[PDB]
Design a protein around this ligand. Structure first.
Ligand SMILES: CC(=O)SCCNC(=O)CCNC(=O)[C@H](O)C(C)(C)COP(=O)(O)OP(=O)(O)OC[C@H]1O[C@@H](n2cnc3c(N)ncnc32)[C@H](O)[C@@H]1OP(=O)(O)O
Ligand SMILES: CC(=O)SCCNC(=O)CCNC(=O)[C@H](O)C(C)(C)COP(=O)(O)OP(=O)(O)OC[C@H]1O[C@@H](n2cnc3c(N)ncnc32)[C@H](O)[C@@H]1OP(=O)(O)O
Lengths: 157, 157
């Protein structure tokens, strides 16, 4: 059938950005409280993620279309850990492609990538996002703090 | 650093290195006593003959420290069709807990994913460490025969 290919996004052209935005909007539908409203919010955040961590921008593809992506930052400073750590800035899969193990593949790819650089991985997830938190805990992430509607999770080597 | 590559030839050097890894991971095959290496040798040769194109090794320098045997042509009567299979997967104890297994499994899934939508494997009933790792990669327990548990990873449409 169709292969789920995980690869580093080589470049963020208007075309790729458009696809990422569609995936983002699709995946965050219903979770606007955390994903923001409108394609503009998505466009700006994705561009920021690319500028900050293009080296760890992985996309899941089925054919010629991107169906999900994860942004891994090997150079993130955490005031909580008081040092440079790994971070996941974004992680989303097209709604139509969710529940098929694609997110799992992206997360494993992320852990393998960051594992070469950091002994700690930090992330923030919405407090109502029990689904994402369940996935993270299954991979060793633990809740360690909060900030408003956001929960901080960490994984140590 | 760790390097993952397809084994191109099962020569004397590679074979003895593979036996060393196998013996380490399976704590010496003490039931066989002085013939332990002979049993490991014959099994490795069998794996190589049956699935050489999916025989990957992890190397630290010029020495093999781990390996995985991926079979893209395994008939499973349980699934009632040809599926992908993992015959063996082991990392030298001195090199375990460093992400080598994860790298080998990612390589395995990438390889088999080009041919099969289903991957089957059998693991010891008390091998909680391996089962945990397989479950993180999407494998699910689906059966048992004697002291062996059958696990399957099936990609959904
Ligand atoms: C740093 C952050 O970016 S936090 C923000 C994370 N992103 C989002 O919330 C955006 C919206 N959600 C998504 O895009 C996706 O649901 C993701 C990325 C969270 C998960 O990816 P998916 O491809 O849907 O999941 P995948 O099919 O690989 O399976 C994920 C596993 O995690 C868990 N999981 C995922 N979603 C849920 C859920 N809604 N409820 C319960 N468990 C869940 C399960 O253990 C599941 O395994 P299973 O199928 O064996 O039960
Ligand atoms: C089809 C079959 O072949 S079944 C036979 C499977 N093989 C065997 O039983 C042989 C003996 N075992 C081995 O050789 C190895 O332990 C393997 C191949 C199972 C795993 O390889 P490894 O290189 O050790 O594991 P790797 O380092 O990639 O990651 C393993 C994960 O397992 C657990 N683990 C491994 N070491 C530790 C540790 N020191 N502390 C805590 N958990 C650990 C964790 O869940 C670890 O977490 P992470 O993923 O968050 O880092």
């Amino acid at each position: 059938m169709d292969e789920i290919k995980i690869e580093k996004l080589k470049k963020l052209d208007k075309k790729a950005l458009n696809e990422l935005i569609d995936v983002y909007m699709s995946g965050y539908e219903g979770l606007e409280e955390y994903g923001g409203e409108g394609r503009d919010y998505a466009r700006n955040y994705i561009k920021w993620c690319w500028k900050k961590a293009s080296d760890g921008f992985f996309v899941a593809k089925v054919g010629d279309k991107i169906v999900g992506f994860i942004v891994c930052d090997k150079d993130w400073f955490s005031k909580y850990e008081g040092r440079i750590v790994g971070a996941i800035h974004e992680f989303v899969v097209d709604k139509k492609f969710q529940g098929k193990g694609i997110g799992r593949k992206l997360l494993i790819t992320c852990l393998d990538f960051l594992g070469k650089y950091n002994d700690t991985i930090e992330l923030w997830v919405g407090e109502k996002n029990y689904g994402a938190m369940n996935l993270y805990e299954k991979f060793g992430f633990k809740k360690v703090g909060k900030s408003g509607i956001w929960v901080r999770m960490i994984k140590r080597q």
